[PDB]
Amino acid sequence: GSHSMRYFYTSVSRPGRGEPRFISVGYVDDTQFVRFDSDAASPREEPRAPWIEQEGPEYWDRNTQIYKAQAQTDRESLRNLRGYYNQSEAGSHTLQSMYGCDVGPDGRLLRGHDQYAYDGKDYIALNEDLRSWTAADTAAQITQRKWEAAREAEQRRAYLEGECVEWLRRYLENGKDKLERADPPKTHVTHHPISDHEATLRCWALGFYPAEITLTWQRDGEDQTQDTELVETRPAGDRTFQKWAAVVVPSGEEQRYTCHVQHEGLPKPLTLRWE
Protein backbone atom coordinates (compact mmCIF):
# COMPACT_ATOMS: atom_id res chain seq x y z
CA GLY A 1 0.00 0.00 0.00
CA SER A 2 1.07 3.61 0.69
CA HIS A 3 4.25 4.20 2.77
CA SER A 4 6.04 7.05 4.57
CA MET A 5 9.59 7.86 5.66
CA ARG A 6 10.19 10.67 8.19
CA TYR A 7 13.12 12.27 10.04
CA PHE A 8 12.23 14.29 13.18
CA TYR A 9 14.93 16.68 14.58
CA THR A 10 14.76 18.49 17.97
CA SER A 11 17.37 21.17 18.90
CA VAL A 12 17.03 22.60 22.45
CA SER A 13 19.21 25.46 23.80
CA ARG A 14 20.10 25.08 27.52
CA PRO A 15 21.94 28.31 28.49
CA GLY A 16 23.83 27.84 31.80
CA ARG A 17 23.31 24.00 31.60
CA GLY A 18 25.44 23.25 28.49
CA GLU A 19 25.55 23.50 24.66
CA PRO A 20 22.28 22.89 22.71
CA ARG A 21 21.13 19.22 22.49
CA PHE A 22 20.29 17.66 19.08
CA ILE A 23 18.12 14.48 18.77
CA SER A 24 17.19 12.86 15.45
CA VAL A 25 14.85 9.86 14.92
CA GLY A 26 14.10 8.11 11.61
CA TYR A 27 10.83 6.35 10.99
CA VAL A 28 9.39 4.18 8.25
CA ASP A 29 5.62 4.17 8.75
CA ASP A 30 5.13 3.55 12.50
CA THR A 31 8.61 1.96 12.98
CA GLN A 32 11.66 3.83 14.39
CA PHE A 33 14.80 2.51 12.57
CA VAL A 34 17.63 4.96 13.62
CA ARG A 35 18.43 7.61 16.22
CA PHE A 36 21.13 10.19 16.93
CA ASP A 37 21.44 11.97 20.32
CA SER A 38 24.24 14.57 20.81
CA ASP A 39 24.10 13.84 24.61
CA ALA A 40 25.20 10.17 24.10
CA ALA A 41 28.96 9.59 24.78
CA SER A 42 30.85 9.91 21.41
CA PRO A 43 27.49 10.06 19.58
CA ARG A 44 26.79 8.10 16.38
CA GLU A 45 23.70 7.13 14.38
CA GLU A 46 22.43 3.94 16.01
CA PRO A 47 20.11 1.21 14.71
CA ARG A 48 16.62 0.86 16.26
CA ALA A 49 15.15 -1.90 13.91
CA PRO A 50 16.81 -5.24 13.06
CA TRP A 51 16.57 -4.84 9.24
CA ILE A 52 18.81 -1.65 9.18
CA GLU A 53 21.74 -3.35 11.04
CA GLN A 54 23.09 -4.95 7.77
CA GLU A 55 23.90 -1.43 6.33
CA GLY A 56 27.73 -1.16 6.07
CA PRO A 57 30.06 1.14 8.02
CA GLU A 58 29.88 3.86 5.24
CA TYR A 59 26.10 4.26 5.91
CA TRP A 60 26.62 4.80 9.71
CA ASP A 61 29.76 7.00 9.24
CA ARG A 62 28.19 9.36 6.64
CA ASN A 63 24.81 9.67 8.53
CA THR A 64 26.71 10.46 11.81
CA GLN A 65 28.58 13.27 9.95
CA ILE A 66 25.22 14.59 8.55
CA TYR A 67 23.62 14.74 12.07
CA LYS A 68 26.70 16.54 13.57
CA ALA A 69 26.65 19.09 10.65
CA GLN A 70 22.81 19.49 11.03
CA ALA A 71 23.20 19.97 14.83
CA GLN A 72 25.74 22.81 14.15
CA THR A 73 23.44 24.41 11.49
CA ASP A 74 20.57 24.22 14.10
CA ARG A 75 22.81 25.91 16.76
CA GLU A 76 23.32 28.83 14.29
CA SER A 77 19.54 28.85 13.43
CA LEU A 78 18.75 29.09 17.22
CA ARG A 79 21.14 32.12 17.61
CA ASN A 80 19.61 33.79 14.47
CA LEU A 81 16.00 33.11 15.63
CA ARG A 82 16.49 34.70 19.12
CA GLY A 83 17.95 37.64 17.09
CA TYR A 84 14.77 37.86 14.92
CA TYR A 85 12.49 37.72 18.03
CA ASN A 86 14.89 39.90 20.13
CA GLN A 87 14.83 37.15 22.86
CA SER A 88 17.11 36.89 25.97
CA GLU A 89 20.35 34.79 25.82
CA ALA A 90 19.18 33.27 29.18
CA GLY A 91 16.04 31.46 27.82
CA SER A 92 15.83 27.84 26.55
CA HIS A 93 14.30 27.64 22.98
CA THR A 94 13.26 24.73 20.72
CA LEU A 95 13.70 24.24 16.95
CA GLN A 96 11.91 21.17 15.50
CA SER A 97 12.25 19.90 11.91
CA MET A 98 10.20 17.22 10.17
CA TYR A 99 10.70 16.00 6.57
CA GLY A 100 10.22 12.97 4.32
CA CYS A 101 8.17 11.36 1.59
CA ASP A 102 4.99 9.33 1.00
CA VAL A 103 5.07 6.69 -1.81
CA GLY A 104 2.09 4.79 -3.31
CA PRO A 105 1.86 0.98 -3.83
CA ASP A 106 3.98 1.42 -7.05
CA GLY A 107 6.78 3.07 -4.97
CA ARG A 108 6.36 6.46 -6.78
CA LEU A 109 6.42 9.80 -4.86
CA LEU A 110 2.94 10.99 -3.71
CA ARG A 111 4.09 14.01 -1.62
CA GLY A 112 7.15 15.54 0.11
CA HIS A 113 7.33 17.39 3.45
CA ASP A 114 9.92 19.81 4.96
CA GLN A 115 8.51 21.90 7.89
CA TYR A 116 9.78 23.58 11.09
CA ALA A 117 8.44 24.80 14.44
CA TYR A 118 10.10 27.31 16.82
CA ASP A 119 9.00 27.17 20.52
CA GLY A 120 6.09 24.83 19.58
CA LYS A 121 4.66 27.06 16.75
CA ASP A 122 4.74 26.54 12.94
CA TYR A 123 7.61 28.72 11.58
CA ILE A 124 8.20 27.83 7.86
CA ALA A 125 7.03 24.96 5.59
CA LEU A 126 7.87 23.80 2.05
CA ASN A 127 4.62 23.91 -0.01
CA GLU A 128 3.34 20.79 -1.85
CA ASP A 129 4.92 22.10 -5.13
CA LEU A 130 8.33 21.54 -3.33
CA ARG A 131 9.38 24.92 -4.91
CA SER A 132 7.99 27.65 -2.55
CA TRP A 133 7.84 28.34 1.22
CA THR A 134 4.99 29.54 3.50
CA ALA A 135 6.23 31.69 6.46
CA ALA A 136 4.17 32.04 9.70
CA ASP A 137 5.32 35.60 10.71
CA THR A 138 7.82 38.39 9.78
CA ALA A 139 10.79 36.49 11.42
CA ALA A 140 10.07 33.44 9.14
CA GLN A 141 9.90 35.82 6.11
CA ILE A 142 13.60 36.65 6.83
CA THR A 143 14.42 32.88 6.66
CA GLN A 144 12.23 32.65 3.50
CA ARG A 145 14.12 35.46 1.64
CA LYS A 146 17.47 33.82 2.68
CA TRP A 147 16.34 30.30 1.59
CA GLU A 148 14.92 31.66 -1.77
CA ALA A 149 18.28 33.47 -2.41
CA ALA A 150 20.18 30.18 -1.63
CA ARG A 151 17.60 28.09 -3.65
CA GLU A 152 17.06 25.82 -0.54
CA ALA A 153 13.74 24.49 -2.02
CA GLU A 154 15.67 22.79 -4.92
CA GLN A 155 18.03 21.10 -2.35
CA ARG A 156 14.91 19.84 -0.48
CA ARG A 157 13.14 18.70 -3.70
CA ALA A 158 16.27 16.77 -4.89
CA TYR A 159 16.23 14.78 -1.58
CA LEU A 160 12.43 14.20 -1.57
CA GLU A 161 12.35 13.03 -5.25
CA GLY A 162 15.69 11.14 -5.07
CA GLU A 163 17.25 9.67 -1.88
CA CYS A 164 14.01 9.86 0.21
CA VAL A 165 12.06 7.62 -2.27
CA GLU A 166 15.08 5.39 -3.14
CA TRP A 167 16.10 4.70 0.51
CA LEU A 168 12.40 4.18 1.57
CA ARG A 169 12.05 1.58 -1.24
CA ARG A 170 15.29 -0.13 -0.10
CA TYR A 171 14.06 -0.20 3.58
CA LEU A 172 10.60 -1.60 2.49
CA GLU A 173 12.43 -4.50 0.69
CA ASN A 174 14.98 -5.21 3.56
CA GLY A 175 12.39 -4.78 6.34
CA LYS A 176 9.43 -6.14 4.37
CA ASP A 177 8.72 -8.87 6.97
CA LYS A 178 8.03 -6.10 9.60
CA LEU A 179 6.90 -3.16 7.37
CA GLU A 180 4.87 -4.80 4.57
CA ARG A 181 3.19 -7.16 7.12
CA ALA A 182 0.81 -6.26 9.99
CA ASP A 183 0.97 -8.03 13.41
CA PRO A 184 -2.53 -8.57 14.88
CA PRO A 185 -3.21 -7.80 18.55
CA LYS A 186 -3.42 -10.32 21.37
CA THR A 187 -7.02 -9.69 22.61
CA HIS A 188 -9.03 -10.40 25.77
CA VAL A 189 -11.85 -8.90 27.86
CA THR A 190 -11.42 -8.27 31.60
CA HIS A 191 -14.23 -7.69 34.17
CA HIS A 192 -13.92 -4.96 36.90
CA PRO A 193 -16.76 -4.39 39.45
CA ILE A 194 -17.19 -0.57 40.13
CA SER A 195 -20.34 -0.42 42.39
CA ASP A 196 -22.92 -2.91 43.73
CA HIS A 197 -24.71 -3.79 40.40
CA GLU A 198 -22.29 -2.63 37.60
CA ALA A 199 -18.96 -3.89 36.08
CA THR A 200 -16.47 -2.26 33.66
CA LEU A 201 -15.79 -4.55 30.66
CA ARG A 202 -12.36 -3.68 29.17
CA CYS A 203 -11.46 -4.93 25.69
CA TRP A 204 -7.64 -5.20 25.30
CA ALA A 205 -5.58 -5.13 22.06
CA LEU A 206 -1.86 -5.79 22.88
CA GLY A 207 1.24 -5.92 20.65
CA PHE A 208 -0.32 -4.87 17.31
CA TYR A 209 1.42 -3.18 14.30
CA PRO A 210 0.66 -0.81 12.69
CA ALA A 211 -0.88 1.62 15.26
CA GLU A 212 -4.16 2.10 13.30
CA ILE A 213 -6.94 0.04 15.03
CA THR A 214 -10.69 0.25 15.84
CA LEU A 215 -12.12 -1.21 19.08
CA THR A 216 -15.98 -1.01 19.29
CA TRP A 217 -18.37 -2.20 22.03
CA GLN A 218 -21.88 -3.35 21.01
CA ARG A 219 -24.82 -4.22 23.35
CA ASP A 220 -27.12 -6.71 21.49
CA GLY A 221 -25.55 -5.52 18.19
CA GLU A 222 -26.12 -1.80 19.11
CA ASP A 223 -23.07 0.55 18.87
CA GLN A 224 -21.96 1.74 22.38
CA THR A 225 -19.26 4.22 21.08
CA GLN A 226 -21.00 7.17 22.88
CA ASP A 227 -20.64 5.35 26.26
CA THR A 228 -17.16 3.82 25.51
CA GLU A 229 -13.89 4.97 27.20
CA LEU A 230 -10.94 4.66 24.71
CA VAL A 231 -7.32 5.20 25.84
CA GLU A 232 -4.86 6.77 23.39
CA THR A 233 -2.89 4.13 21.45
CA ARG A 234 0.39 3.59 23.37
CA PRO A 235 3.74 1.92 22.59
CA ALA A 236 4.27 -1.59 24.10
CA GLY A 237 8.00 -0.71 23.98
CA ASP A 238 8.97 -3.40 21.47
CA ARG A 239 7.76 -1.53 18.32
CA THR A 240 4.19 -2.80 18.73
CA PHE A 241 1.23 -0.87 20.20
CA GLN A 242 -1.55 -1.29 22.84
CA LYS A 243 -5.10 0.05 23.18
CA TRP A 244 -8.23 -0.75 25.20
CA ALA A 245 -11.93 0.26 25.19
CA ALA A 246 -14.08 0.12 28.40
CA VAL A 247 -17.92 0.16 28.93
CA VAL A 248 -19.90 0.06 32.23
CA VAL A 249 -22.50 -2.80 32.08
CA PRO A 250 -25.07 -4.32 34.48
CA SER A 251 -23.56 -7.32 36.36
CA GLY A 252 -24.80 -10.61 34.72
CA GLU A 253 -25.57 -8.90 31.31
CA GLU A 254 -21.90 -9.12 30.12
CA GLN A 255 -22.76 -11.69 27.36
CA ARG A 256 -24.93 -8.99 25.69
CA TYR A 257 -21.65 -7.02 25.01
CA THR A 258 -19.41 -7.84 22.00
CA CYS A 259 -16.04 -6.11 21.48
CA HIS A 260 -15.28 -5.73 17.75
CA VAL A 261 -11.57 -5.49 16.77
CA GLN A 262 -10.59 -4.16 13.30
CA HIS A 263 -6.83 -4.31 12.42
CA GLU A 264 -4.84 -4.88 9.15
CA GLY A 265 -3.24 -7.95 10.87
CA LEU A 266 -6.71 -9.64 11.17
CA PRO A 267 -8.01 -11.35 8.00
CA LYS A 268 -11.53 -11.02 9.59
CA PRO A 269 -12.50 -8.51 12.33
CA LEU A 270 -12.77 -10.26 15.77
CA THR A 271 -15.90 -10.39 17.99
CA LEU A 272 -14.99 -10.92 21.69
CA ARG A 273 -17.16 -11.52 24.77
CA TRP A 274 -16.23 -11.64 28.47
CA GLU A 275 -15.36 -15.31 29.35
Partner: peptide, 9 residues
Protein backbone atom coordinates in the same frame (compact mmCIF):
# COMPACT_ATOMS: atom_id res chain seq x y z
CA UNK B 1 19.07 7.97 5.01
CA UNK B 2 18.94 11.58 6.27
CA UNK B 3 18.97 14.68 4.04
CA UNK B 4 22.20 16.69 3.97
CA UNK B 5 22.23 19.91 5.88
CA UNK B 6 22.14 23.15 4.00
CA UNK B 7 21.35 26.68 5.17
CA UNK B 8 20.72 27.96 8.64
CA UNK B 9 17.51 29.91 9.30
Amino acid sequence: EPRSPSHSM
